[PDB]
Amino acid sequence: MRLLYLHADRFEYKTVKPALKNPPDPPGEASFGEALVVFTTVEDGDGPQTVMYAASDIASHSSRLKVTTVILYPYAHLSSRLAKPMAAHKRLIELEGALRTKFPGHVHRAPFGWYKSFSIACKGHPLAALSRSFTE
Amino acid sequence: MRLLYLHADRFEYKTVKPALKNPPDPPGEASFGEALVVFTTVEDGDGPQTVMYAASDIASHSSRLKVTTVILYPYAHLSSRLAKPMAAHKRLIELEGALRTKFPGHVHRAPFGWYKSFSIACKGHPLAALSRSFTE
Ligand SMILES: Nc1ncnc2c1ncn2[C@@H]1O[C@H](CO)[C@@H](NC(=O)[C@@H](N)CO)[C@H]1O
Ligand SMILES: Nc1ncnc2c1ncn2[C@@H]1O[C@H](CO)[C@@H](NC(=O)[C@@H](N)CO)[C@H]1O
């Protein structure tokens, strides 16, 4: 699993065209104020251990940043070792459930399997952009 | 070299704190309308061949997107095989010069070695976000 942690001032997205023949989540749109935006690329061989480590690390960083909102943003573009889309979906749903057991704030998982527009205003402090890898 | 191609409606950044003891470029800020934003992570072992391939590919994609502006945005966060910062700087300067020989539009290289805030509004079409790897 490869993650990009962006400490946003604001963030929004909207699904546009379906990126898979049958996107497993419905379309939609949302916007937020200050949040940790977690661009999330599920990688070949990710499993529940990987999910568990990633959730703990996201919760620990959110704590370090004093943020109350985490967006899990499916992203197909952070690595060249992608999990197939059905395994990918399965892992993101797991990641969402695992983070809730570790982080007391708002957890928002963006829909999986669509092309999406988004806007972000990302902070410039030394910890506002970091990337993480998790495996098992 | 790892690149993330974002087809933006708009993009801006400003340097904040220095990220290296002596950032080799001066601080600053800029904003743009429709541009291809190229988040660029220089990787261990990148050389002039890598630079040459990346410049050709960025020019070819910009053409495919009918964009007139390319932002080369140094980014330390797209891989776990980073080039040291002096080699990294050297490669980005090379990449900027190489792209100019391949693409007729505005080329803007953002400064290297600072933490930066940025805002982007990224398009949602099927080609608005893609990643590329180059080596030699
Ligand atoms: N291995 C993987 N990890 C994370 N997400 C993955 C994935 N495989 C497929 N997706 C999702 O399918 C859409 C098209 O690839 C993806 N959509 C996107 O990556 C959009 N932000 C592009 O606009 C994403 O929702
Ligand atoms: N291998 C590499 N490839 C691309 N850029 C690199 C690099 N090594 C160092 N940098 C630059 O130094 C700043 C701190 O790492 C980096 N700054 C950033 O990555 C900011 N966007 C964070 O706010 C970047 O300017």
Numbering used by the authors:
A (entry chain A), B (entry chain A): 1 to 136
What does the paper say about this structure?
We have been interested in a D-aminoacyl-tRNA deacylase (DTD) fold that is present across the domains of life in two different functional contexts: as an N-terminal editing domain (NTD) of archaeal ThrRS, which specifically removes non-cognate L-serine mischarged on tRNAThr, and as a freestanding ‘chiral proofreading' enzyme, which removes D-amino acids from tRNAs in bacteria and eukaryotes. Both share a striking structural and mechanistic similarity highlighting a common ancestry. Here we show, with the help of structural, biochemical and biophysical studies from three distant organisms, that the substrate specificity in this domain is determined by a differential remodelling of the catalytic centre at the RNA–protein interface rather than just the presence or absence of catalytic water as previously proposed. While demonstrating that the tRNA provides the catalytic group, we show that the side chains within the recognition site are dispensable for the proofreading function, suggesting a primordial mode of protein- or peptide scaffold-based enzymatic activity evolved alongside that of RNA.
To rule out any genus-related phenomenon and to test the universality of the observation, we chose to do biochemical experiments with NTD from Aeropyrum pernix (ApNTD), which belongs to a different phylum (Crenarchaeota), and shares ∼43% identity with PabNTD. Remarkably, the corresponding mutants Y115A, E129A and Y115A/E129A in ApNTD also retained completely the capability to discriminate between seryl and threonyl substrates. However, in ApNTD, it has only a water-mediated interaction with the corresponding Glu129, whereas in the case of MjNTD, this group is directly recognized by both Glu135 and His84. Structural studies were also carried out with the mutants of the amino-acid pocket in ApNTD. While E129A mutant also showed a loosening of interactions upon L-Thr3AA binding as observed in the case of wild type, no such loosening was observed in the case of Y115A, thus providing a rationale for rejecting the cognate substrate in the mutants.
